Amino acid sequence: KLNIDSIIQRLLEVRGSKPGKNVQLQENEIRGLCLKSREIFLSQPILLELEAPLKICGDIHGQYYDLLRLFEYGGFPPESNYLFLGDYVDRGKQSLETICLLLAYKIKYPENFFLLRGNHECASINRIYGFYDECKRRYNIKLWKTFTDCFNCLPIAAIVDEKIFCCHGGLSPDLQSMEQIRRIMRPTDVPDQGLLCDLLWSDPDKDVLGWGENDRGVSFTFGAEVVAKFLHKHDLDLICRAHQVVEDGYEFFAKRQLVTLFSAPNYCGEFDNAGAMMSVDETLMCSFQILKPA
Ligand SMILES: C=C1[C@@H](O)[C@@H]2O[C@]3(CC[C@H](/C=C/[C@@H](C)[C@@H]4CC(C)=C[C@@]5(O[C@H](C[C@@](C)(O)C(=O)O)CC[C@H]5O)O4)O3)CC[C@H]2O[C@@H]1[C@@H](O)C[C@H](C)[C@H]1O[C@@]2(CCCCO2)CC[C@H]1C
Ligand SMILES: [Mn+2]
Ligand SMILES: [Mn+2]
């Protein structure tokens, strides 16, 4: 029914055009991307088990031309396998093009392209920070609600080669075993505090070794001792997350037991931060590709 190759073709057709140029897909096509990807997300585990080689990206926040630059620098699917950590919409000027290209690739390469849920893939959040407004202006609210139903089915975490735990926010004082994550039911909005909330909102903190207070007004912060206990209990080597804007695009925390990735250069057009993508080769060696704020 859905012509994925044509959709991708039109979305990529703007490579080279002046940044900011829109790609206006038909309402039916976008709705189809949501419904089809939703089916795929539900068919795969909520806790993904992936293998390198892989390219991992952090927050994109509707900066579509920067997403294009990422693919330009890392290789357009299926040239390279990808895992995004969430926060595809809000703040930026082109959340629509951004999320549609990502969903399109998920449908086109379901086994080589993966997307995790960020806190911005939650209705209460993308309703206020831009996505709703973009949908209201370019399409309609019914379509925005359709996106919400899609987002409610996104997976929550992934483990790369049994060594790298990936999630959007961070750890939770309720997280004792991976099975707790696998048992999370979808579709799900994030109505209550707890495990899922923390996985989407928590942040690492340098000042405390254990659990601390989070300035976001939700969830908690976690220190190096918490991370160490986590990694050892599940025989992991690193936690890879996003959620926090970092000046260089990537930054290590908790004595390098954790790395934060942010892929949207000059966030909100008010930061001079760079964007970064982390490459994981087949020998489990990590390298970082930086996107200078252009
Ligand atoms: C979003 C957020 C948080 O993350 C944010 O955290 C804080 C701590 C660190 C963080 C700083 C971020 C900066 C780098 C950016 C840079 C720029 C240029 C703009 C700005 O942008 C922030 C929002 C956003 C999106 O851009 C983000 O970057 O986070 C707000 C402050 C702005 O100066 O700060 O600011 C404090 C303010 C807090 O404000 C909101 C928070 O009130 C949201 C609230 C908790 C939510 O509660 C509910 C109910 C409970 C469960 C969760 O859902 C419903 C929905 C919503 C009301
Ligand atoms: Mn986030
Ligand atoms: Mn973010």
CSV table of C-alpha atoms and ligand atoms in Angstrom, one decimal:
chain,number,residue,atom,x,y,z
A,1,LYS,CA,0.0,0.0,0.0
A,2,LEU,CA,2.6,2.5,1.1
A,3,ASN,CA,5.3,3.6,-1.4
A,4,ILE,CA,8.3,3.7,1.0
A,5,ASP,CA,10.9,4.2,-1.8
A,6,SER,CA,9.0,7.3,-3.1
A,7,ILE,CA,8.7,8.7,0.4
A,8,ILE,CA,12.4,8.3,1.1
A,9,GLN,CA,13.2,9.7,-2.4
A,10,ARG,CA,11.2,12.8,-1.7
A,11,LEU,CA,12.6,13.2,1.8
A,12,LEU,CA,16.2,12.9,0.6
A,13,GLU,CA,15.5,15.0,-2.5
A,14,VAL,CA,16.3,18.1,-0.4
A,15,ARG,CA,19.9,17.1,0.1
A,16,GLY,CA,21.8,20.1,-1.2
A,17,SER,CA,18.8,22.4,-1.1
A,18,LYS,CA,19.1,25.4,1.1
A,19,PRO,CA,18.7,24.2,4.8
A,20,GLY,CA,15.2,24.6,6.1
A,21,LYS,CA,13.5,23.7,2.8
A,22,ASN,CA,10.4,21.6,3.6
A,23,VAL,CA,9.3,18.3,2.3
A,24,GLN,CA,5.5,18.1,2.5
A,25,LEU,CA,4.4,14.4,2.3
A,26,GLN,CA,0.7,13.6,2.0
A,27,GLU,CA,-1.3,13.0,5.2
A,28,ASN,CA,-2.0,9.4,4.2
A,29,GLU,CA,1.7,8.7,3.7
A,30,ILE,CA,2.7,10.0,7.2
A,31,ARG,CA,-0.2,8.2,8.8
A,32,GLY,CA,1.0,5.0,7.0
A,33,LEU,CA,4.6,5.5,8.3
A,34,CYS,CA,3.2,5.7,11.8
A,35,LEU,CA,0.9,2.6,11.6
A,36,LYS,CA,3.4,0.5,9.7
A,37,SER,CA,6.4,1.3,12.0
A,38,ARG,CA,4.1,0.8,15.0
A,39,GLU,CA,3.5,-2.7,13.8
A,40,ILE,CA,7.2,-3.3,13.5
A,41,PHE,CA,8.1,-1.8,16.9
A,42,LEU,CA,5.5,-4.1,18.6
A,43,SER,CA,6.8,-7.1,16.7
A,44,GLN,CA,10.4,-6.6,18.0
A,45,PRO,CA,11.5,-6.7,21.7
A,46,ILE,CA,11.1,-3.6,23.9
A,47,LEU,CA,14.7,-4.4,25.0
A,48,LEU,CA,16.7,-4.7,21.8
A,49,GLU,CA,19.7,-7.0,21.4
A,50,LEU,CA,21.9,-5.6,18.6
A,51,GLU,CA,25.4,-6.4,17.2
A,52,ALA,CA,28.1,-4.1,15.9
A,53,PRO,CA,29.1,-2.6,13.5
A,54,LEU,CA,26.6,0.1,14.5
A,55,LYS,CA,26.3,3.9,14.5
A,56,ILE,CA,24.6,5.4,17.6
A,57,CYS,CA,23.1,8.8,17.7
A,58,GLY,CA,21.6,11.1,20.4
A,59,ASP,CA,19.0,13.8,20.4
A,60,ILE,CA,18.0,15.2,17.0
A,61,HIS,CA,15.1,17.5,18.0
A,62,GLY,CA,13.8,18.2,14.5
A,63,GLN,CA,17.1,19.5,13.1
A,64,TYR,CA,16.4,17.7,9.8
A,65,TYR,CA,19.4,19.0,7.8
A,66,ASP,CA,21.7,17.9,10.7
A,67,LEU,CA,20.1,14.5,10.5
A,68,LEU,CA,21.0,14.5,6.8
A,69,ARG,CA,24.5,15.5,7.7
A,70,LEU,CA,24.8,12.6,10.1
A,71,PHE,CA,23.8,10.1,7.4
A,72,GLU,CA,26.1,11.9,5.0
A,73,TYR,CA,29.0,11.5,7.4
A,74,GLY,CA,28.1,8.0,8.7
A,75,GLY,CA,26.6,6.5,5.5
A,76,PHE,CA,23.0,6.4,4.4
A,77,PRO,CA,21.1,3.3,5.2
A,78,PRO,CA,21.6,0.5,4.6
A,79,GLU,CA,25.3,1.4,4.2
A,80,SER,CA,25.6,1.4,8.0
A,81,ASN,CA,23.4,0.1,10.8
A,82,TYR,CA,21.9,2.7,13.1
A,83,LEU,CA,20.5,3.0,16.6
A,84,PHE,CA,19.0,6.4,17.7
A,85,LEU,CA,18.4,7.0,21.4
A,86,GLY,CA,15.3,9.2,21.1
A,87,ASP,CA,14.2,12.9,21.1
A,88,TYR,CA,13.5,13.1,17.4
A,89,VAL,CA,11.0,16.0,17.8
A,90,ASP,CA,10.5,19.3,19.5
A,91,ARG,CA,12.7,22.5,19.6
A,92,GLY,CA,13.9,22.2,16.0
A,93,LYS,CA,12.1,23.6,12.9
A,94,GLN,CA,11.5,20.3,11.1
A,95,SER,CA,10.4,17.5,13.5
A,96,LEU,CA,8.1,16.2,10.7
A,97,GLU,CA,10.8,15.6,8.1
A,98,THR,CA,13.0,14.2,10.8
A,99,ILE,CA,10.6,11.7,12.3
A,100,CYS,CA,9.3,10.6,8.9
A,101,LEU,CA,12.7,9.9,7.4
A,102,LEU,CA,13.5,7.9,10.6
A,103,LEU,CA,10.3,5.9,10.5
A,104,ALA,CA,10.7,5.4,6.8
A,105,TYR,CA,14.1,3.8,7.3
A,106,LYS,CA,12.8,1.7,10.2
A,107,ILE,CA,10.1,0.3,7.8
A,108,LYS,CA,12.6,-0.1,4.9
A,109,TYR,CA,15.4,-1.7,7.0
A,110,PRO,CA,13.7,-3.1,10.1
A,111,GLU,CA,16.7,-5.3,11.0
A,112,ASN,CA,19.4,-2.7,10.4
A,113,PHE,CA,17.8,0.5,11.7
A,114,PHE,CA,16.5,1.0,15.2
A,115,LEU,CA,14.9,3.8,17.3
A,116,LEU,CA,14.5,4.1,21.0
A,117,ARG,CA,12.0,6.2,22.9
A,118,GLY,CA,13.1,9.5,24.4
A,119,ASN,CA,11.2,11.7,26.8
A,120,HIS,CA,10.1,13.9,23.9
A,121,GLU,CA,8.4,10.9,22.3
A,122,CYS,CA,5.7,11.5,25.0
A,123,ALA,CA,2.5,13.4,24.3
A,124,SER,CA,2.7,15.6,27.4
A,125,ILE,CA,6.1,16.8,26.3
A,126,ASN,CA,5.9,17.1,22.5
A,127,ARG,CA,2.6,18.9,23.0
A,128,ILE,CA,4.3,21.8,24.6
A,129,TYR,CA,7.8,22.0,23.0
A,130,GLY,CA,7.1,22.3,19.3
A,131,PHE,CA,5.9,19.1,17.7
A,132,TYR,CA,2.2,19.7,18.3
A,133,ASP,CA,2.6,23.3,16.9
A,134,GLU,CA,4.4,22.0,13.8
A,135,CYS,CA,1.7,19.4,13.2
A,136,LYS,CA,-1.1,22.0,13.8
A,137,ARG,CA,0.5,24.4,11.3
A,138,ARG,CA,1.5,21.9,8.5
A,139,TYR,CA,-1.1,19.2,8.9
A,140,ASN,CA,-3.5,18.8,11.8
A,141,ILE,CA,-3.9,17.6,15.5
A,142,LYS,CA,-5.4,14.3,14.5
A,143,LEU,CA,-2.1,13.5,12.8
A,144,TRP,CA,-0.2,14.5,15.9
A,145,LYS,CA,-2.3,12.1,17.9
A,146,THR,CA,-1.5,9.4,15.4
A,147,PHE,CA,2.2,10.1,16.0
A,148,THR,CA,1.6,9.7,19.8
A,149,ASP,CA,0.1,6.3,19.3
A,150,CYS,CA,3.2,5.3,17.3
A,151,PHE,CA,5.6,6.8,19.9
A,152,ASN,CA,3.8,4.8,22.7
A,153,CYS,CA,5.1,1.6,21.1
A,154,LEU,CA,8.8,2.5,20.7
A,155,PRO,CA,11.3,0.2,22.4
A,156,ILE,CA,13.0,1.5,25.6
A,157,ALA,CA,16.5,0.1,25.6
A,158,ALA,CA,19.1,-1.9,23.7
A,159,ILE,CA,22.2,-4.0,24.5
A,160,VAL,CA,25.0,-3.9,22.0
A,161,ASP,CA,27.0,-7.1,21.8
A,162,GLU,CA,26.1,-7.9,25.4
A,163,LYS,CA,28.3,-5.0,26.5
A,164,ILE,CA,26.7,-1.6,25.9
A,165,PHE,CA,23.5,-0.8,27.6
A,166,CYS,CA,21.6,2.0,25.7
A,167,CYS,CA,18.7,4.0,26.8
A,168,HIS,CA,17.5,7.6,26.6
A,169,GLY,CA,17.8,8.9,30.1
A,170,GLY,CA,19.4,6.6,32.6
A,171,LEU,CA,19.2,4.2,35.5
A,172,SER,CA,16.4,3.8,38.1
A,173,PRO,CA,16.4,2.9,41.8
A,174,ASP,CA,13.8,0.3,40.7
A,175,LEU,CA,15.9,-1.3,38.0
A,176,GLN,CA,17.3,-4.6,39.4
A,177,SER,CA,17.1,-6.9,36.3
A,178,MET,CA,16.7,-6.7,32.6
A,179,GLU,CA,13.6,-8.8,32.9
A,180,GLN,CA,11.9,-5.8,34.5
A,181,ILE,CA,12.4,-3.9,31.2
A,182,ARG,CA,11.3,-6.8,29.0
A,183,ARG,CA,8.1,-7.1,31.0
A,184,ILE,CA,7.1,-3.5,30.3
A,185,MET,CA,3.8,-3.5,28.3
A,186,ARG,CA,3.1,-1.5,25.2
A,187,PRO,CA,1.4,0.6,24.1
A,188,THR,CA,2.1,2.8,27.0
A,189,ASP,CA,2.1,6.5,27.8
A,190,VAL,CA,4.2,7.3,30.8
A,191,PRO,CA,1.5,8.0,33.5
A,192,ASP,CA,3.4,7.1,36.6
A,193,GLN,CA,6.7,7.8,38.3
A,194,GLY,CA,9.0,4.7,38.5
A,195,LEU,CA,11.1,2.5,36.2
A,196,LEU,CA,9.9,3.6,32.7
A,197,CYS,CA,9.8,7.3,33.8
A,198,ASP,CA,13.4,7.1,35.1
A,199,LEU,CA,14.7,5.3,31.9
A,200,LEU,CA,13.4,8.3,29.9
A,201,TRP,CA,14.3,11.1,32.3
A,202,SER,CA,17.2,10.3,34.8
A,203,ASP,CA,20.6,11.9,34.5
A,204,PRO,CA,24.1,11.0,35.8
A,205,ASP,CA,25.5,13.3,38.5
A,206,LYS,CA,29.1,14.0,39.4
A,207,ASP,CA,28.5,15.2,43.0
A,208,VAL,CA,26.8,12.1,44.4
A,209,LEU,CA,27.9,8.4,44.3
A,210,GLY,CA,24.4,7.1,44.8
A,211,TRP,CA,21.0,8.6,44.2
A,212,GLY,CA,20.5,12.3,43.9
A,213,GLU,CA,17.9,15.0,43.2
A,214,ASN,CA,17.1,15.9,39.6
A,215,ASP,CA,16.7,19.6,38.7
A,216,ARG,CA,14.3,18.6,35.9
A,217,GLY,CA,11.6,18.2,38.5
A,218,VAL,CA,11.1,14.6,37.7
A,219,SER,CA,13.0,11.3,38.3
A,220,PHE,CA,16.5,11.2,39.9
A,221,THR,CA,20.2,11.5,39.3
A,222,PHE,CA,22.6,8.7,39.7
A,223,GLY,CA,26.3,8.5,40.6
A,224,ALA,CA,29.3,6.3,39.8
A,225,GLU,CA,28.6,3.7,42.5
A,226,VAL,CA,25.1,3.1,41.1
A,227,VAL,CA,26.5,2.7,37.6
A,228,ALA,CA,29.3,0.4,38.7
A,229,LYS,CA,26.8,-1.9,40.5
A,230,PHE,CA,24.6,-1.9,37.4
A,231,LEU,CA,27.4,-2.8,35.0
A,232,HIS,CA,28.8,-5.6,37.1
A,233,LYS,CA,25.5,-7.2,37.9
A,234,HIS,CA,24.6,-7.5,34.2
A,235,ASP,CA,28.2,-8.0,33.0
A,236,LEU,CA,28.2,-4.8,30.9
A,237,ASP,CA,31.1,-2.4,30.1
A,238,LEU,CA,29.3,0.8,29.3
A,239,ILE,CA,26.1,2.8,29.4
A,240,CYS,CA,25.3,4.9,26.4
A,241,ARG,CA,22.5,7.4,26.7
A,242,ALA,CA,21.5,10.9,25.4
A,243,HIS,CA,19.0,13.3,26.9
A,244,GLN,CA,21.6,15.9,28.0
A,245,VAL,CA,23.0,18.7,25.8
A,246,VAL,CA,26.8,18.5,25.9
A,247,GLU,CA,29.2,21.1,24.5
A,248,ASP,CA,31.2,18.6,22.4
A,249,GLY,CA,28.4,16.3,21.2
A,250,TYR,CA,29.5,13.5,23.4
A,251,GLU,CA,30.8,13.4,27.0
A,252,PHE,CA,31.8,10.7,29.5
A,253,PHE,CA,30.4,10.6,33.0
A,254,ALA,CA,30.8,8.3,36.1
A,255,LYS,CA,34.5,7.8,35.5
A,256,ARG,CA,33.9,6.9,31.9
A,257,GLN,CA,31.4,4.1,32.7
A,258,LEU,CA,28.9,6.2,30.9
A,259,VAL,CA,28.8,8.3,27.7
A,260,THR,CA,26.1,10.8,26.8
A,261,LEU,CA,25.4,11.5,23.1
A,262,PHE,CA,23.7,14.6,21.7
A,263,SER,CA,23.4,14.9,17.9
A,264,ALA,CA,21.8,18.3,17.4
A,265,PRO,CA,24.4,21.0,16.8
A,266,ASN,CA,23.6,24.5,18.2
A,267,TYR,CA,20.6,23.2,20.1
A,268,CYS,CA,17.5,25.6,20.0
A,269,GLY,CA,19.8,27.8,17.9
A,270,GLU,CA,21.0,29.2,21.2
A,271,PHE,CA,23.9,26.8,22.0
A,272,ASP,CA,27.3,26.6,20.4
A,273,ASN,CA,27.3,22.9,21.2
A,274,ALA,CA,28.5,20.4,18.6
A,275,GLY,CA,26.7,17.2,17.7
A,276,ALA,CA,28.2,13.8,17.9
A,277,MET,CA,27.6,10.2,16.6
A,278,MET,CA,29.4,7.2,18.2
A,279,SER,CA,30.6,4.4,15.9
A,280,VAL,CA,31.0,0.9,17.3
A,281,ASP,CA,33.1,-1.4,15.2
A,282,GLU,CA,33.0,-5.2,15.2
A,283,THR,CA,35.9,-5.4,17.7
A,284,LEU,CA,33.8,-3.4,20.1
A,285,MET,CA,35.9,-0.3,19.8
A,286,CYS,CA,34.3,3.1,20.0
A,287,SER,CA,35.1,6.2,18.0
A,288,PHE,CA,33.2,9.6,17.8
A,289,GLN,CA,32.2,11.5,14.8
A,290,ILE,CA,31.6,15.2,15.5
A,291,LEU,CA,29.2,17.5,13.7
A,292,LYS,CA,30.4,21.1,14.0
A,293,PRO,CA,27.7,23.7,14.4
A,294,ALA,CA,27.4,24.7,10.7
B,1,LIG,C1,11.5,19.9,29.8
B,1,LIG,C2,11.7,20.3,31.0
B,1,LIG,C3,13.0,19.8,31.8
B,1,LIG,O1,13.8,18.9,31.0
B,1,LIG,C4,13.8,21.0,32.3
B,1,LIG,O2,14.9,20.5,33.1
B,1,LIG,C5,15.7,21.7,33.6
B,1,LIG,C6,16.9,21.1,34.4
B,1,LIG,C7,18.0,21.1,33.2
B,1,LIG,C8,17.3,21.7,32.0
B,1,LIG,C9,18.0,22.6,31.0
B,1,LIG,C10,18.0,22.5,29.7
B,1,LIG,C11,18.7,23.5,28.8
B,1,LIG,C12,19.8,22.7,28.1
B,1,LIG,C13,17.7,24.1,27.9
B,1,LIG,C14,18.4,25.2,26.9
B,1,LIG,C15,17.3,26.0,26.3
B,1,LIG,C16,17.7,26.7,25.0
B,1,LIG,C17,16.1,26.1,26.8
B,1,LIG,C18,15.7,25.5,28.0
B,1,LIG,O3,14.7,24.4,27.6
B,1,LIG,C19,14.1,23.6,28.7
B,1,LIG,C20,13.2,22.6,28.1
B,1,LIG,C21,13.8,21.7,27.0
B,1,LIG,C22,12.7,20.7,26.4
B,1,LIG,O4,14.3,22.4,25.9
B,1,LIG,C23,14.8,20.8,27.6
B,1,LIG,O5,16.1,20.9,27.0
B,1,LIG,O6,14.7,20.0,28.5
B,1,LIG,C24,13.5,24.5,29.8
B,1,LIG,C25,14.5,25.5,30.3
B,1,LIG,C26,15.0,26.3,29.1
B,1,LIG,O7,16.0,27.3,29.5
B,1,LIG,O8,16.7,24.8,28.7
B,1,LIG,O9,16.2,22.4,32.5
B,1,LIG,C27,14.8,22.5,34.5
B,1,LIG,C28,13.6,23.0,33.7
B,1,LIG,C29,12.8,21.8,33.2
B,1,LIG,O10,11.7,22.2,32.4
B,1,LIG,C30,10.9,21.2,31.8
B,1,LIG,C31,10.0,20.6,32.9
B,1,LIG,O11,9.3,21.5,33.6
B,1,LIG,C32,9.0,19.5,32.4
B,1,LIG,C33,8.1,18.9,33.4
B,1,LIG,C34,8.9,18.0,34.4
B,1,LIG,C35,7.1,17.9,32.6
B,1,LIG,O12,6.2,17.3,33.7
B,1,LIG,C36,5.3,16.3,33.2
B,1,LIG,C37,4.5,15.9,34.5
B,1,LIG,C38,5.5,15.0,35.4
B,1,LIG,C39,6.2,13.9,34.7
B,1,LIG,C40,6.9,14.4,33.4
B,1,LIG,O13,5.9,15.2,32.6
B,1,LIG,C41,4.4,16.9,32.1
B,1,LIG,C42,5.2,17.6,31.0
B,1,LIG,C43,6.2,18.7,31.6
B,1,LIG,C44,5.3,19.9,32.2
B,2,MN,MN,15.6,13.8,26.5
B,3,MN,MN,16.8,16.2,24.5
